Amino acid sequence: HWGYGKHNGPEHWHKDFPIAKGERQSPVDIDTHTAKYDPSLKPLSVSYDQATSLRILNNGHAFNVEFDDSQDKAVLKGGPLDGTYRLIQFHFHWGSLDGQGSEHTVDKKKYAAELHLVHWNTKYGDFGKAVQQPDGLAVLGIFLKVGSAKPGLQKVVDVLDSIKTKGKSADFTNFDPRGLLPESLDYWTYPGSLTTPPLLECVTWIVLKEPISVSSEQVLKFRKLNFNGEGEPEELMVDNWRPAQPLKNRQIKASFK
Ligand SMILES: NS(=O)(=O)c1ccc(O)c(NC(=O)NCc2ccncc2)c1
Ligand SMILES: [Zn+2]
Numbered sequence: 001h002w003g004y005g006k007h008n009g010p011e012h013w014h015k016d017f018p019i020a021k022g023e024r025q026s027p028v029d030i031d032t033h034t035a036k037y038d039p040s041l042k043p044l045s046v047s048y049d050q051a052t053s054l055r056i057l058n059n060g061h062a063f064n065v066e067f068d069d070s071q072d073k074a075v076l077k078g079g080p081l082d083g084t085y086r087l088i089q090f091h092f093h094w095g096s097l098d099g100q101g102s103e104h105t106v107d108k109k110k111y112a113a114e115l116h117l118v119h120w121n122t123k124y125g126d127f128g129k130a131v132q133q134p135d136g137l138a139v140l141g142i143f144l145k146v147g148s149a150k151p152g153l154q155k156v157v158d159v160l161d162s163i164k165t166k167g168k169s170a171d172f173t174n175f176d177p178r179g180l181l182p183e184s185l186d187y188w189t190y191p192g193s194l195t196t197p198p199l200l201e202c203v204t205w206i207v208l209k210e211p212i213s214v215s216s217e218q219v220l221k222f223r224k225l226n227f228n229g230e231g232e233p234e235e236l237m238v239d240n241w242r243p244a245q246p247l248k249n250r251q252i253k254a255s256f257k
Helices: 010-015 151-163 216-222
Strands: 044-047 053-058 063-067 075-078 085-094 113-121 137-146 169-171 187-192 203-208 212-214
Touching: 053 151, 063 151, 075 113, 085 137, 085 216, 137 216, 151 169, 151 216
Parallel strands: 137 203, 137 212
Antiparallel strands: 044 075, 053 063, 053 169, 063 085, 075 085, 085 113, 113 137, 187 203
């Protein structure tokens, strides 16, 4: 099975998931000079006040903080989106070094990590149906650079010792995802895909211009996770990012000029 190693990493995924070579694959490089400012883009509406986190899970590729998505508690609307998308989970991708780790790049620049807040279009009833649809998901992507700590991330960092290995989960209630958001909600947007298998072309990507800063110690704790299950040989969970894919005939739009 697929992963991020030398024999099963991103360049291998197309053998099991042929859509890996598709027409709207993610991530991509965001060339900020070819991005098109679109005055008709609405501001993003992020309504996380009622969010209910439930638990945190090491799935062998990243860790997911999962939310109750059985009601409109934490929703994303506006921006390029029609209708309401519900937060189901967030996770991150990160590097072995501070100089790499993000999936999207900005003018070929790589950030230390990238946060994905995953939301599904409520008109499809649940996440499983939504991923089968071209407008099924909206993923809000936020870059992390290494600098000052992000206090709102610390509760995530502190529980990672409880989920070191693949398949481990821990109760993780009352986490407020608003503490992971940068000041500005200026964004780029383009149609794309999940960045891990099954690589389905179901995502409206919304990538924030402004990164959040996290401390070196915070991202180091990410790197102490393991891809392997307990009692298997230890392989650090680092470099769990897919590289940029061809833009093909897509234009990236910007909400700001
Ligand atoms: N990166 S993303 O484009 O925001 C994204 C958003 C929502 C997703 O459902 C996926 N993809 C998966 O969930 N794949 C199954 C899986 C992945 C990792 N480990 C175990 C199982 C990727
Ligand atoms: Zn992701």
